[model samples]
Target chain A: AASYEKEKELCVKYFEQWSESDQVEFVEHLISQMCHYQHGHINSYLKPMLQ
Target chain B: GAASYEKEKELCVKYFEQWSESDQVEFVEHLISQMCHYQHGHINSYLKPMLQ
Candidate 1:
């Protein structure tokens, strides 16, 4: 859990702070990470990248 | 939708040990108060208290 996690619409907040290209990359990366994390190799990429 | 969100985040970076407990309490308190306020529920009950 991140400190930012509790903020309302925090994902939107951070996304807005990033460039459009970085935002797109972050979203794709986040989605892939979440998908892989949920699929079980949580430690492989998601956890570290999240940090 | 509320204030001090970024402050809470910075707190985590500084005093993680302290922030961990206090922030949890504050957040739960916040959510409960907001939910009760939004729902218009005034029924107060004795719930288990969590210590920081």
Candidate 2:
């Protein structure tokens, strides 16, 4: 149902509004953190935040 | 742990309309890729206030 290309496309507009460097920096930082963190039941953390 | 603030927050929320579909899925993929303790611990702080 989801693809990386499609995911990026979804944010491309807001990302585009950001400064050129902001996109690269934000994605690299957030994506990097998200990728590296594999904590137990991140669901609890994530689900709570969403609600 | 994603994206917008006050006026900027609502602005981010505006951009949010585009995200419900994709980020939601991508975020799912992120969690599915790995689900555990250390990950949440490191990121807990960032994720909470990121939205609230």
Candidate 3:
């Protein structure tokens, strides 16, 4: 596995360069890719916030 | 009171949208691959306040 720290840094650097629209589009894509387990877990967390 | 469900979802989506596509993909992949206790524990904190 890669260094979490290194991954984080690279993640942030790439993230900062993206346009807002691209970011949102990608997020929507990511959300679509979540499996049932992941969706359920995230939904549990998101429910209260959404509520 | 919290934001409306649609509003909150929009906000959450907006929050993630700040990252590059590659970054978002990598992070989500890591999130899935590393659904470890430690990773979730950290996510819980970041995930919570972002909504409220």
Error of 1 at A3 (Å): 9.5
- Residue B4's C-alpha lDDT in candidate 2? 53
Native-contact fraction for each model?
0.00, 0.00, 0.02
Model 3 lDDT, residue A36, Cα = 55
RMSD of each candidate relative to the true structure: 16.8, 11.0, 12.6
TM-score of each: 0.27, 0.29, 0.39
lDDT of 3 by residue, B1-52 (tens): 1334344445445545565554455566543343444444444454444433
For candidate 2, write residues B1-52 as lDDT tens digits: 2345124334433443455453543544454234344444444555445433
Ranking by DockQ: 2, 3, 1
lDDT per residue as tens, model 3, A1-51: 145445465544444445444444444455664445554556474444322
For candidate 3, the per-residue lDDT at A46 reads 40
Ranking under TM-score, best-scoring first?
3, 2, 1
Clashing pairs in 2: A38-B39, A39-B36, A39-B37, A39-B38, A39-B39, A39-B40, A40-B36, A40-B37, B5-B8, B5-B9
Relative to the unseen true structure, what is the C-alpha lDDT of residue A21 in candidate 3, on a scale of 0 to 100? 43
The alpha-carbon deviation from the true structure for residue B18 of candidate 1, after best TM-score superposition, in angstroms, is 20
Of the two candidates 2 and 3, the one with more favorable TM-score, higher being better, is 3
* The best candidate in terms of DockQ: 2
lDDT of 1 by residue, B19-49 (tens): 4443434433333332322121221111101
TM-score quality measure for candidate 2:
0.29
